Amino acid sequence: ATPADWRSQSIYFLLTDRFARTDGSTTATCNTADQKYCGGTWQGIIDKLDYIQGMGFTAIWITPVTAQLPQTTAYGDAYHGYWQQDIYSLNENYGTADDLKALSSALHERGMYLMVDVVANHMGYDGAGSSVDYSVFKPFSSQDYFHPFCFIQNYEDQTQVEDCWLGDNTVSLPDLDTTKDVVKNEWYDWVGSLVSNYSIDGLRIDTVKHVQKDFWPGYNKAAGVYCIGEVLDGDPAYTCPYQNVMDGVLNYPIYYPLLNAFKSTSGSMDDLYNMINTVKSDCPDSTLLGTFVENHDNPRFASYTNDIALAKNVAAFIILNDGIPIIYAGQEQHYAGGNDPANREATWLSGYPTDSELYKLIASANAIRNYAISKDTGFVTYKNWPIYKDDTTIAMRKGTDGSQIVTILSNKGASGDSYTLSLSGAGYTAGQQLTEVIGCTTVTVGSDGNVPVPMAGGLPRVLYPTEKLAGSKICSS
Ligand SMILES: *[C@@H]1O[C@H](CO)[C@@H](O)[C@H](O)[C@H]1NC(C)=O
Ligand SMILES: [Ca+2]
Numbered sequence: 001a002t003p004a005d006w007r008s009q010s011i012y013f014l015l016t017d018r019f020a021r022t023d024g025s026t027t028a029t030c031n032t033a034d035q036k037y038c039g040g041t042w043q044g045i046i047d048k049l050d051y052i053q054g055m056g057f058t059a060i061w062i063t064p065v066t067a068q069l070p071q072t073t074a075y076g077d078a079y080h081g082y083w084q085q086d087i088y089s090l091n092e093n094y095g096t097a098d099d100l101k102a103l104s105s106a107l108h109e110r111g112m113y114l115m116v117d118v119v120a121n122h123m124g125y126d127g128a129g130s131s132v133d134y135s136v137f138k139p140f141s142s143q144d145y146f147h148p149f150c151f152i153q154n155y156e157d158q159t160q161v162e163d164c165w166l167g168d169n170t171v172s173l174p175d176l177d178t179t180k181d182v183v184k185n186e187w188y189d190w191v192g193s194l195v196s197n198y199s200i201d202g203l204r205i206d207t208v209k210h211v212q213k214d215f216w217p218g219y220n221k222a223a224g225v226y227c228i229g230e231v232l233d234g235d236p237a238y239t240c241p242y243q244n245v246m247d248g249v250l251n252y253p254i255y256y257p258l259l260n261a262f263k264s265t266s267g268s269m270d271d272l273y274n275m276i277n278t279v280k281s282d283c284p285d286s287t288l289l290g291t292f293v294e295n296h297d298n299p300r301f302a303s304y305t306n307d308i309a310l311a312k313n314v315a316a317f318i319i320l321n322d323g324i325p326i327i328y329a330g331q332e333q334h335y336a337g338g339n340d341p342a343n344r345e346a347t348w349l350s351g352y353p354t355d356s357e358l359y360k361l362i363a364s365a366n367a368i369r370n371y372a373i374s375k376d377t378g379f380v381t382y383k384n385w386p387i388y389k390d391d392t393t394i395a396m397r398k399g400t401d402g403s404q405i406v407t408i409l410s411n412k413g414a415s416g417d418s419y420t421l422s423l424s425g426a427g428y429t430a431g432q433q434l435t436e437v438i439g440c441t442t443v444t445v446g447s448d449g450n451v452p453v454p455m456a457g458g459l460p461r462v463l464y465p466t467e468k469l470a471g472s473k474i475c476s477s
Helices: 003-007 044-047 049-055 097-109 158-163 181-198 211-222 236-244 252-262 270-281 309-320 357-375
Strands: 009-014 057-061 066-068 082-092 113-118 169-174 202-205 226-229 326-329 385-390 395-396 404-412 419-423 433-436 439-444 449-455 461-465
Touching: 003 226, 044 057, 044 066, 044 097, 097 113, 097 181, 113 181, 181 211, 202 211, 211 226, 236 252, 236 270, 252 309, 270 385, 270 395, 309 326, 309 357, 309 404, 326 357, 357 404, 357 461, 404 419, 404 449, 439 449, 449 461
Parallel strands: 009 057, 009 326, 057 113, 113 202, 202 226
Antiparallel strands: 066 082, 385 395, 395 404, 404 461, 419 449, 433 439, 433 461
């Protein structure tokens, strides 16, 4: 698929080893602290697609598929897939090439896209950087294809961040010399060949900031699909520019104030407010970025607060903000693991309850989003923008006039009081009836143009014109 095709997508991010086993067990042991392969496979994913698609997701992003280092390191196995050694072979732990082909097929059949996580920055190796036997890596079987050995000590030195190695002497990550044309051509031919042999619709590019920019354009072109990269920095000035060399990047600029705004009933609505506008103007295209508040490199949201209402609100923001929504497997089951490895819990251990509170919130949010796009070709391109905010609230508006979705979020929490917010600025016609598609209730725009929104239980409210819902099966009553 193309970037344009992706704008309208909703991503469910999962770790192949931790989503679903071929047998389907929901009790098979997976101690995150052991950092060992727990059994997740590609076939396991196919068997649980109903579960995923049932939340309104239109795509999935799975971790890297290349063959990893074999050893169980002092830090566990390469179950996460970021320690590759043979790029022309697949991690047999997940299955065969036929399984991977069958996975994308099952998806394309459901009208869903398949996004694959790929690493061009490094290989993995069990041991000190001085003991690396380069012949092990394929095709890059020589030390020349790599940068001289050194560990990145000063992350403020970009050249270092790009020329030195990640990891340490326990588990080092041999750093490829992405300036040598032999490397680039190999990587460009590989990625193109990869997307082709597995019918991949888009790519999530790992450690994008550790590889020099002039490498990414050709990679993105060779991929022949949409590429969203991981530039691990919350500074929009440093992160957004990468979209000039790659179709999109993960929205880490929004991530931090987003998390802080809803992780407690005293979060800063201001910071989120302003980051939204800053990104909207400074970033090449906010509608091509990826929104999230939870992933495998940060404590899960629930680790900060177990408040279900706050969880609903942050999840609602992720789905309604500009760009592509990205939910990390387990988030919908209120998982609360902390920093890696604690945040790589197996999804199956939850029992895949399709009636959990966040599973429903997400379904409802994705439903209205998916519907709106189906009737408004300008939605995905309409820059979300905040129309209101107070110490515990923020409201935004997105979508062509007459068909806009107006989202009201609150960090008051589950014990939030009940009151009426007179929302101004929504832009709906006076007297028009609206449907709050999360709780499925209506509200009528006042004569003055303001919308009396009933606030309670610190719940998120999402408005859309009731008349526009004619036909759909959103809030059938
Ligand atoms: C594409 O398929 C051929 C054989 O079917 C295989 O040899 C080649 O390595 C595959 N490309 C990649 C990068 O997997
Ligand atoms: Ca590098």
